[PDB]
Design an enzyme around this catalytic site. Structure first.
Site, short mmCIF file in Angstrom:
data_model
loop_
_atom_site.label_atom_id
_atom_site.label_comp_id
_atom_site.label_asym_id
_atom_site.label_seq_id
_atom_site.Cartn_x
_atom_site.Cartn_y
_atom_site.Cartn_z
N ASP A 63 74.34 30.71 -19.81
CA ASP A 63 75.80 30.21 -19.90
C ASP A 63 76.85 31.22 -19.94
O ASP A 63 78.09 31.12 -20.42
CB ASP A 63 75.91 29.39 -21.20
CG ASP A 63 75.02 28.17 -21.06
OD1 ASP A 63 74.57 27.50 -20.13
OD2 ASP A 63 74.49 27.87 -22.05
N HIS B 288 75.78 24.51 -14.36
CA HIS B 288 76.59 25.76 -13.98
C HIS B 288 77.89 24.72 -13.81
O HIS B 288 78.19 23.88 -12.90
CB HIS B 288 76.20 26.17 -12.62
CG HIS B 288 74.99 26.95 -12.87
ND1 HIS B 288 74.67 28.16 -12.09
CD2 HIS B 288 73.78 26.70 -13.71
CE1 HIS B 288 73.58 28.44 -12.44
NE2 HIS B 288 72.98 27.77 -13.30
N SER B 289 79.18 25.43 -14.38
CA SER B 289 80.54 24.75 -14.30
C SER B 289 81.32 25.50 -13.55
O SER B 289 81.27 26.89 -13.57
CB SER B 289 80.95 24.46 -15.66
OG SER B 289 80.15 23.65 -16.31
N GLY C 296 89.86 33.51 -17.20
CA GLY C 296 90.14 32.17 -17.43
C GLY C 296 89.18 31.26 -16.76
O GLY C 296 88.58 31.66 -15.83
N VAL D 89 74.37 20.20 -19.98
CA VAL D 89 73.50 19.33 -19.81
C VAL D 89 73.32 18.59 -21.00
O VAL D 89 72.94 17.38 -20.93
CB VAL D 89 72.30 20.08 -19.50
CG1 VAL D 89 71.13 18.97 -19.03
CG2 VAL D 89 72.16 20.75 -17.82
N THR D 90 73.07 19.01 -22.12
CA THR D 90 72.54 18.33 -23.12
C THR D 90 73.74 18.06 -24.31
O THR D 90 73.69 17.30 -24.99
CB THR D 90 71.61 19.31 -24.01
OG1 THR D 90 72.23 20.37 -24.41
CG2 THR D 90 70.34 19.46 -23.17
N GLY D 91 75.01 18.70 -24.02
CA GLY D 91 76.10 18.45 -24.88
C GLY D 91 75.71 19.13 -26.13
O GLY D 91 76.88 18.80 -27.10
N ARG D 92 74.81 19.80 -26.35
CA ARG D 92 74.57 20.54 -27.90
C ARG D 92 75.58 21.91 -28.02
O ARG D 92 75.91 22.51 -26.81
CB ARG D 92 73.19 21.22 -27.59
CG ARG D 92 72.27 20.05 -28.02
CD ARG D 92 70.85 20.51 -27.91
NE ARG D 92 70.45 21.25 -26.75
CZ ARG D 92 69.27 21.98 -26.21
NH1 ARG D 92 68.51 22.28 -27.37
NH2 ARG D 92 69.02 22.51 -25.16
N1 LIG Z 1 88.30 30.59 -20.92
C1 LIG Z 1 87.31 30.80 -19.90
N2 LIG Z 1 86.21 30.02 -19.64
C2 LIG Z 1 85.37 30.53 -18.44
C3 LIG Z 1 85.73 31.67 -18.00
N3 LIG Z 1 84.46 31.80 -17.17
C4 LIG Z 1 83.86 30.58 -17.02
N4 LIG Z 1 84.35 29.85 -17.96
C5 LIG Z 1 83.98 28.36 -18.43
O1 LIG Z 1 82.91 28.61 -19.40
C6 LIG Z 1 81.87 27.60 -19.47
C7 LIG Z 1 80.30 28.25 -19.52
O2 LIG Z 1 79.67 28.39 -18.50
P1 LIG Z 1 78.37 27.37 -17.87
O3 LIG Z 1 78.98 26.07 -17.79
O4 LIG Z 1 77.33 27.30 -18.97
O5 LIG Z 1 78.10 27.98 -16.52
P2 LIG Z 1 76.53 28.96 -16.26
O6 LIG Z 1 77.06 30.47 -16.94
O7 LIG Z 1 76.58 29.26 -14.89
O8 LIG Z 1 75.77 28.19 -17.25
P3 LIG Z 1 73.93 28.48 -16.70
O9 LIG Z 1 73.69 28.13 -15.49
O10 LIG Z 1 73.12 27.90 -17.90
O11 LIG Z 1 73.47 30.01 -16.69
C8 LIG Z 1 81.92 26.90 -17.87
O12 LIG Z 1 82.28 25.87 -18.10
C9 LIG Z 1 83.25 27.73 -17.17
O13 LIG Z 1 84.27 26.87 -16.63
C10 LIG Z 1 86.70 32.59 -18.42
O14 LIG Z 1 86.84 33.49 -17.73
N5 LIG Z 1 87.41 32.23 -19.37
O1 LIG Z 2 71.24 26.87 -18.45
C1 LIG Z 2 70.97 26.96 -19.64
N1 LIG Z 2 71.77 27.71 -20.48
C2 LIG Z 2 71.52 28.20 -21.74
N2 LIG Z 2 70.23 27.82 -22.00
C3 LIG Z 2 69.33 27.35 -21.27
C4 LIG Z 2 69.67 26.79 -20.12
N3 LIG Z 2 68.60 26.07 -19.54
C5 LIG Z 2 67.71 26.31 -20.60
N4 LIG Z 2 68.17 26.80 -21.51
C6 LIG Z 2 67.33 27.08 -22.85
O2 LIG Z 2 65.86 27.24 -22.32
C7 LIG Z 2 65.16 26.79 -23.46
C8 LIG Z 2 64.30 26.06 -22.79
O3 LIG Z 2 64.59 25.20 -21.78
P1 LIG Z 2 63.81 24.63 -20.58
O4 LIG Z 2 64.15 25.73 -19.39
O5 LIG Z 2 64.26 23.21 -20.24
O6 LIG Z 2 62.45 24.45 -20.77
C9 LIG Z 2 65.93 26.57 -24.46
O7 LIG Z 2 66.09 27.33 -25.34
C10 LIG Z 2 67.45 25.98 -23.91
O8 LIG Z 2 68.33 26.00 -24.67
O1 LIG Z 3 73.96 24.79 -19.68
C1 LIG Z 3 73.17 24.05 -20.41
N1 LIG Z 3 73.09 23.85 -21.61
O2 LIG Z 3 73.77 24.84 -22.02
C2 LIG Z 3 72.26 23.24 -22.34
C3 LIG Z 3 72.58 21.71 -22.66
O3 LIG Z 3 73.24 21.38 -21.44
O4 LIG Z 3 72.44 21.07 -23.52
MG LIG Z 4 74.83 26.34 -18.24
#
Ligand SMILES: Nc1nc2c(ncn2[C@@H]2O[C@H](COP(=O)(O)OP(=O)(O)OP(=O)(O)O)[C@@H](O)[C@H]2O)c(=O)[nH]1
Ligand SMILES: O=c1[nH]cnc2c1ncn2[C@@H]1O[C@H](COP(=O)(O)O)[C@@H](O)[C@H]1O
Ligand SMILES: O=CN(O)CC(=O)O
Ligand SMILES: [Mg+2]
Ligand SMILES: Nc1nc2c(ncn2[C@@H]2O[C@H](COP(=O)(O)OP(=O)(O)OP(=O)(O)O)[C@@H](O)[C@H]2O)c(=O)[nH]1
Ligand SMILES: O=c1[nH]cnc2c1ncn2[C@@H]1O[C@H](COP(=O)(O)O)[C@@H](O)[C@H]1O
Ligand SMILES: O=CN(O)CC(=O)O
Ligand SMILES: [Mg+2]
Lengths: 337, 337
Positions: free
Chosen positions: B12, B42-43, B325, B252-255
């Site tokens: 994240d 991924h957002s 941002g 994904v999980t809203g946790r």
């Molecule tokens: N305020 C702010 N928010 C950001 C910035 N960059 C990304 N975000 C937001 O932060 C959030 C967190 O990122 P994730 O949705 O978990 O995307 P990710 O890092 O690819 O997550 P994983 O696939 O689990 O590794 C996203 O919804 C983005 O829109 C930033 O520079 N500033």
């Molecule tokens: O993309 C994600 N972002 C942050 N944590 C993740 C993500 N995907 C899986 N995890 C973490 O990975 C562990 C197990 O996830 P799993 O890959 O579904 O078995 C838990 O601690 C989750 O929170």
């Molecule tokens: O990026 C995925 N997570 O942060 C876990 C979840 O969606 O619950």
């Molecule tokens: Mg993520």
């Protein structure tokens, strides 16, 4: 620099014998194993004496090369200790290091691998327990080397040690197990091993970013072999393997190898996905006996030379290492071409 | 060239938003995505509209590009089709390609991942079923994408396409999932994901040799986050996370994400094993509000610059991408240094 050695077929291509030569010849500071675990049997002949290892890398001969086992590799405590004893003449025990994050093969795992109708009968696996162990590791319930107290004197950070060495310019040799054809991803699923085996995976096993990898040597044998079931396009009848004297038995299970002719289209594919920089061909003496013992390229018989060149052009990767026999000296080193 | 994007913490870190910028800005021909599977969220914010993908690579934005899913990745058909539907205006359905060797997430996997006391209760996993699926794949019991008839129009060879592209000189962008801290090998076992996540593993997922990897971007966020249980050295009380307005919920999980202070020692280690060539830092606006929207380095506030520079010296890797941002334009691109 950095060198990674991987198999281009279904394992047993002579990876051990090549890591052997490179260890003695190039004198690396660190020689590390990646791969799956102990399901691998790597053999080397040292002045007429054949050795066979499963856990310790095939380079113990180098009394001055730190021997490491990457975190991505499974560790079987029984096998590791047996090989400490089996190789006492090389002082392996003082030069060896197990990554504290390695997962542990337990007897429950060996069991399952040896008994179940699917892995034993259908695939059929080695019985090392490498399969079920990785399943337990994926399920995150398997124990790590950190938790086995008899392994504490040998615990280290292989990822750090290797990277620390690469910063000072030292040479690091990395040994992978199996071959491309047994890759969990790109091999002949489900007749494969429990893990990807390509050079990228091997790098991740020891703890090396892809950018830190200078050289990738992909090992091929003149006649590819398969242990166990699974598709083999260029497979020959067993009667021919005898006639050409291509009979070999597993180093762990002791089962016959299935023998076949050189698959060129598979070779090109295997080499390219691995990102091969250099090819290494073994058992050329078995393709043409007149090539036995030869150490210079141009003194090779002609039938041998058109094989290396046919490979070099149909695979698109230069062959810089040609082994012409079981012995260490039975090698052609064209690293300057 | 070749660029691989991976996480440096516990996922994240904003990997999606960065693959986002790079897709539009550098215009790659291909944009494969590694990782484990659908457990990733991924957002990206596109002109005020926030998207979230799990199967299709961030980079769907780029209409010129081919969107690929490497063989090492798990595929959930339901999610894949839902995201084809969730993203029509970008016509993803025609530009997408699934490697025919990808393993399949079935509903048996999802249920076990959501119900089992160990995976759900202790770790606790995502519930995507990525864990049990990989276990079934390691056990070589899992189904491949070739065997799913609903997926036939999208079946391809990602390894071939990517390598074929790298030969023509084209740019290939590769997206990984999670972060180093969740690595099966080097993360906080057993509180990790079901697979190694470093760049080398990501390279193996799509079918790229380590030598073919030119650049490795490791993504960090100003305040590291953890979803689920597990050790977190620089963890702050939840009171402070709200105080600093650092509240974020799982894609994904809203946790709710556990928040902590920037762990510098973990960053150097994470970056080094990944073989990082370039760092990318996101959410600098969350570290200092005055840095919001800034697109040029020159005009960052002082407190903002001593953070980037403290990172650059305590991690030993230049920061060539700074996101300020949620929006695409909210980026500082110092790749020319
Ligand atoms: N305020 C702010 N928010 C950001 C910035 N960059 C990304 N975000 C937001 O932060 C959030 C967190 O990122 P994730 O949705 O978990 O995307 P990710 O890092 O690819 O997550 P994983 O696939 O689990 O590794 C996203 O919804 C983005 O829109 C930033 O520079 N500033
Ligand atoms: O993309 C994600 N972002 C942050 N944590 C993740 C993500 N995907 C899986 N995890 C973490 O990975 C562990 C197990 O996830 P799993 O890959 O579904 O078995 C838990 O601690 C989750 O929170
Ligand atoms: O990026 C995925 N997570 O942060 C876990 C979840 O969606 O619950
Ligand atoms: Mg993520
Ligand atoms: N005749 C002949 N035998 C060779 C040559 N090179 C290696 N060998 C032998 O061939 C045998 C087969 O190799 P393996 O024992 O399977 O070693 P490996 O390739 O590392 O096996 P895996 O770990 O399973 O991949 C070894 O015992 C070597 O001693 C050669 O050039 N000529
Ligand atoms: O090192 C080896 N050489 C050749 N084949 C191997 C080797 N190790 C495992 N295999 C093959 O990999 C499959 C499963 O092995 P395992 O899962 O590692 O126990 C079977 O087809 C084995 O023959
Ligand atoms: O190298 C291992 N084999 O060749 C299989 C076995 O030992 O049976
Ligand atoms: Mg062998």
């Amino acid at each position: 620099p950095s060198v990674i050695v991987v198999g281009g077929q279904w394992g047993d291509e002579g990876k051990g014998s090549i890591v052997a030569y490179l260890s003695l010849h190039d004198e690396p500071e660190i020689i590390a194993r990646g791969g799956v675990g102990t399901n691998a049997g790597h053999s080397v002949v040292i002045n007429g004496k054949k050795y066979a290892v499963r856990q310790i890398p095939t380079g113990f001969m180098q009394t001055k090369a730190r021997l490491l086992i990457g975190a991505g590799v499974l560790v079987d405590p029984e096998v590791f200790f047996h090989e400490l004893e089996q190789l006492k003449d090389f002082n392996v025990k003082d030069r060896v290091g197990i990554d504290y994050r390695c997962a542990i093969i337990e007897e429950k795992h060996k069991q399952l691998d040896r008994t179940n109708g699917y892995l034993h009968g259908k695939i059929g696996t080695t019985g090392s327990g490498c399969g079920p162990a990785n399943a337990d590791r994926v399920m995150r319930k398997a124990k790590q080397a950190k938790d086995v107290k008899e392994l504490e004197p040998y615990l280290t950070d292989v990822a750090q040690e290797i990277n620390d060495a690469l910063d000072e310019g030292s040479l690091v040799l990395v040994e992978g197990t199996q071959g491309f054809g047994l890759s969990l991803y790109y091999g002949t699923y489900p007749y494969v091993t429990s893990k990807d085996v390509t050079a990228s995976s091997v790098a991740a096993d020891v703890g090396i970013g892809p950018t830190r990898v200078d050289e990738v040597i992909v090992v091929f044998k003149s006649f590819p072999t398969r242990v166990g079931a699974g598709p083999f396009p260029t497979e020959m009848p067993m009667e021919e393997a005898d006639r050409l004297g291509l009979v070999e038995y597993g180093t762990v299970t002791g089962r016959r190898r299935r023998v076949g002719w050189f698959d060129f289209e598979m070779a090109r594919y295997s080499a390219r996905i691995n990102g091969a920089t250099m090819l290494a061909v073994t058992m050329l003496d078995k393709y043409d006996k007149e090539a036995f013992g030869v150490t210079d390229y141009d003194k090779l018989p002609r039938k041998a030379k058109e094989f290396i060149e046919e490979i070099e052009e149909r695979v698109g990767v230069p062959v810089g290492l040609i082994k012409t026999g079981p012995e260490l000296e039975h090698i052609i080193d064209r690293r300057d071409t």
